[model samples]
Structures are given as structure tokens and as C-alpha cells.
Target: KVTVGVIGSGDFAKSLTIRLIRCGYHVVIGSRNPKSASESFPHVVDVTHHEDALTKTNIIFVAIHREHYTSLSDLRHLLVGKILIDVSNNMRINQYPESNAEYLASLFPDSLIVKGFNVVSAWALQLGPKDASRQVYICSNNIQARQQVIELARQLNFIPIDLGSLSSAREIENLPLRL
Candidate 1:
């Protein structure tokens, strides 16, 4: 089974973790507090820090908020040659013009980063309703990474729509409306 690691422990992270686990992936939940995670998600292996989680998994889902981005550089080394799925659609708490996803990709050249899972809501992700004829937009500079993520999205019962290269990820990441 593909090993996946989640770098947040909030509602979105928990819901996505359950979904990935249901889809037959081995998932490890990472948080500043591993003890808390163990209490909340008994089936998940909890790691004390983000770097630890990144080091142990093949794929990592960055579920932290935008404010946490600057600190992400700490895990840059661990991300080398790994797949980093960026789901952070960070809107200003009370404003417009959210940060673009490409910024993260540009910062981590050694990693194959793909932008996804930010279009839908946490509830939608938890339910994972199938849209066999529809497509979920995805953008990434790495063809292999994009294909891998598209396949992962399909396993979660979503239709995959490639929106072209990672530069397009900026536009897709800062959409005016949510799906």
C-alpha cells in the first residue's frame, strides 16, 4: 500500500486521513502534539513533528494554514524527491486575494509538488461524492507527480482534470469561488 503522511491534525486533516485510509493507503498523522493525535485517531500512527512525518512517508499532504507556510522551509530537505500535495487554499481571514499555490512549489525545487484538494470543502472531502463524468482540477509542473495525484484523486472517487502546468496552479489556487 502507498504510505501517506498528513502534516496537520485539524478537521480537514482528520477527514482526509480517513478518506485515504478507506482507499487502502497506510497513513501517518503528524502534528506538534503526537499524543493528542493518538488520542483522537487511534488507527493512525502519530509523529511528533512535520519533518519526522515527511521523512517516513513517500507522499505528504500539507494541510496547514497559510500562516504556516514560512515555517514549511524547515522540512525542505525531507521533501527532496518526494511528492508534496499542497491543499492549502489560504484566504485572508476577512479579505480577498489568497496566496497562490505555485509559491510553495517554487520554494521547494527538489520536491514534486501538486496543487489539489483546495477547491472543495472539508465536508465534501469527507463524503467524497463521486462525479464520474465531472472533473476535479489539478495543476503541477511535474508530469509524473501530476499523474500520481490524478490517480489518487480518482481512487477517492473524484474525476481528475489537468489544468496544465504548475504556473497555472497559481490561478487555480486563487479561484474566486469554491466548488
Candidate 2:
């Protein structure tokens, strides 16, 4: 099974983890407290410290808020060449000078940054991507990473819409807000 890591212990992370596990993918969670996260998931998922999770997988879903991102800086070495997916969202449009994904790219230049799933909800993840409304917007500087996300979304039954380059991330991130 393809093992992946999700950074955060929020509802979104939990939902995503469960869905992935149900889909036959192995998941590792990166949380502030490794022990707590380790306790959160059972046979379906594995949980560990931020640094520990990276050792297990190259792709990491960053499911935390923008303010909580700085905590990842110290793990730069483990993140290099890894796929860092920004699944964060802003409560309002133009919430920052740049999109959360763009900021993540700048902050961790080595990791291939992909932006997607901000339009999806934790509840939707728990339910499914079976509905016609289950369209997912994805964009990234790295073509391979973007394609990887598109493929993964498809596997999860989501209709993946490519928004081209990472420059389109802000546009994708603002999608749910407009609806």
C-alpha cells in the first residue's frame, strides 16, 4: 500500500485518514504530540511525531491552519524532495498576501508543493467523492506532483480539475468561499 503522512490532528485530518485507510492506503499522522496521535488511530492508521511521519512517507498532507505552519520548519531535511500538499483554507478571501500553498512553497522550497482539497469538507471526506459535486481543484509547480494529486483524487472517486500552474492555487483556494 502507498503510505502517506498527514500533518495535523483536526477533523479534516482524521476524516482524510479514515477515507484513505478505507481505500487501502496506509496513512501516518504527524501531530504535535506523537503519543496522542498514535493513540488516535488504530490498525487503520499510524501516528507519530512530525519528524517521525516523514521518515515513513514522502507525501504529507498539511491539514492545519496557516498560523500553525511554522512548526514544520525544523523538519526541512526530511521534507526535501517530498510532496507537501497544502490543504489549508482561509475564512475570507485575500486572507494573506499570498495563497497558503504559495507561502508553503516559499517556506519549504525543496518540497514539491501541491494545492488542493480546500473546497472539500471533513464531512464530505467521511461520506465520499461519489456525488457529482465531488470535484477537486489541484495545482502545483511540479508537474509530477500535480499529476500525483490528480491521480489520487481519482482513486478516491473525485473528479480532479487541473488548474495548471501553482499560480492558480489562490484561485482554487478561493473556490468554496465563492460558493
Candidate 3:
């Protein structure tokens, strides 16, 4: 019942978007250049400005890298109650002291934070063959939020493991960075 929105239009976003649409979810891509972003994916992806993407869908994939987080404050007003699928990873271990998803929660306190998609690399996800467990880890403070994201993973053909709260984010965040 949730329409998916991807905030970044890079290889990471492209891979995730394809998998999502393949699962029958209507996906919208949020990009700096909406026009070109649509061209890469000639499917039913509705590409548009980042702010508008947030308005169109409540469930958004934070496929953006962790460095560009400075611009996120501008959209804080539209993100309350929104499910932020933190599909981000750090360049180095303890890069942020806390996890990328935890820092995101600090940015938007009211929104539901689901730490996921940090298990596998974008290349591996794009090369996704069959059932992969080593994927999109679903963790949050809310039970329903975790459950909902879990279903999203199931629908998207990605196996997700719920590890409870964002407190566990630092652990899972380093998963892909290791092996």
C-alpha cells in the first residue's frame, strides 16, 4: 500500500528502484535533474524534484550517500511520520561515531527510522540472483515500522533481518564495509 520514493538517482538508486518496481511497487525517483534520471529507467518510474518526491510518497529510500546529508534539513517539515529507509553506508568504520541512520533520526526526530540496505553493496544488489539474506537490514524503535519495512523487503525480493532498535545500527552499518 506504500508508494516507494528514491531520494538519490545514482547507481545505488537505480538498482534499488529496479528491484522495487519489479516487485510491483509504484516507485518515484527524487533527483537533482528529474528529466535525465527518468531516461535511465524507461519503466514506470515517475522522476521529479526531491521535495515533490517526498510529497508524493510517504515511504522514501534514503539511497543518498551520507555526505550530502547537509541539505536534508530543508525537507524536515515534510518528513514527519514518513518511513525513511536508510539505505546508506559509510566510507570508513566509525565514520560518524553513531550510525548513518541514527544521525538521520537526530535530524528528524518525529519520523519513523528504519535502518536497512546497509548489508550488501550496490553491485551485489544489482547482481542479485535468488534469495539473498545478507541484504537490507530492518531495524527501528517501533515494532510496526520494522514489520512494515520487513514486508517491503519481502515484496522487493530482498531478505531483511530486524535487529530491534537504531542502537544496533552501528553494528549493521559496518556489515557491508567489512565483507
Candidate 4:
């Protein structure tokens, strides 16, 4: 079984957690506060720290807000050799410009970071798109990690497009603003 550890407890995290649970994956929600994490995802296990979740799961989802990236610096060691799925949209609520993925890649050099699930809304992730054949773009530095994410996307009933290499993440992640 594919165990996924999500390091956030917000709306987006909950939405993705529910989908992963529905898809039969073991989902573990991690937060600074164990109580809040448990409350947010009662059906799954919740850890108070990122390290606890990292030690138990193979796949890690960095679902925290962009502004909270500094807090994540401490967890960088745990991210090495792991599939870090980044779904953060570094937009400032319609005020400033969006943050680029190249910057994110540079920040976490030790991680095999794959960017996806940010362009689509939370509702879209839960219900998916109207066209069943619609594709979801995924970009990663590691080919194996990218293939794993593609399999997960296919299991969720979405067509997976491998954009090739981490550099491609910059362009794919910017698609939301263009539309």
C-alpha cells in the first residue's frame, strides 16, 4: 500500500486527504498540533511533528502555505530521498504576483519535488474536471517519483502528463494564472 504523509491541516489538505482515503491509500496528517490534526482528519492518524510522519511514510506531501516555508527549513533533512509533492500556490490573495516553482526547487535541493494539484481548485480535485479525458500535468526531477505520481493520478481517474524534469515545473505551475 502507498502511504502518504501530508504536512498540513488546512482546507486543501483535508480535500486531498479525503481523496487519498477514498482511493484506498493510508493517509497520515501531520501538524504542529496533534489535537488539531486529529480533529481535522479523524479517520487517519495525525502526528504532531513532520519527522514523525516522515519516518512512517514513503511519500510526503508538503501542503503548507508558501508563507510558512521558513518553518519547513527545519524539516529539510527528513525530505532527502523522498517524493515531496508540492501543491502550494504562492499567490498573495489577488494582490501580488505568484511565486515561481524554480525558486521552490532551489530551496529544497535534497528533495525529489514534483509539482502538481496547484493549478486545479480544491473542488476540482475532489470532483475532478467535467471532461473525463482531461489531463493533469506533473513535473519532477526524478523519473521514478514522476511515474509514481502519474500512477496516483491515474488511480484518481485523471490523465497524467509527465512534463519531464524539475525545470518543467516552473512553466506548468504558472498555467493557472494564464487561464
* Strongest candidate by lDDT: 2
For model 4, how does the per-residue alpha-carbon lDDT over 1-179 read when each residue is reduced to its tens digit? 67888888888888888778778888877788877567777655555677788887877777887667677777777778878787877443332242444555567787777877776566876787669536888888788988988888888677888888777766676666665
lDDT of each: 0.75, 0.88, 0.81, 0.74
For residue 78, model 3's alpha carbon misses the true position, in angstroms, by: 0.8
TM-score between model 1 and native: 0.86
Which stretches of candidate 3 lie above 4 Å from their native place?
129-135
Q: What lDDT tens digits, residue by residue, belong to model 1 across residues 72-94?
A: 78777877998888887655332
Clashing residue pairs for model 1: none
* Candidate achieving the largest TM-score: 2
TM-score of candidate 4 against the unseen true structure: 0.87
lDDT of 3 by residue, 1-179 (tens): 45798898888888887777667888888888888777877667889998899988878888888788767878888888999888788778778777888888888898888998767666665777445354567799878888988988878677777789888889788876786
State model 2's lDDT: 0.88
Q: Against the correct fold, how does model 3 do in TM-score?
A: 0.91
TM-scores for every candidate against the unseen true structure: 0.86, 0.96, 0.91, 0.87
Cα RMSD, each candidate: 2.8, 1.1, 1.8, 2.7
**Residue by residue across 36-109, what tens digits does model 2's lDDT show?**
66666775677778888889988889999988788889888789999998998888887899999999999999
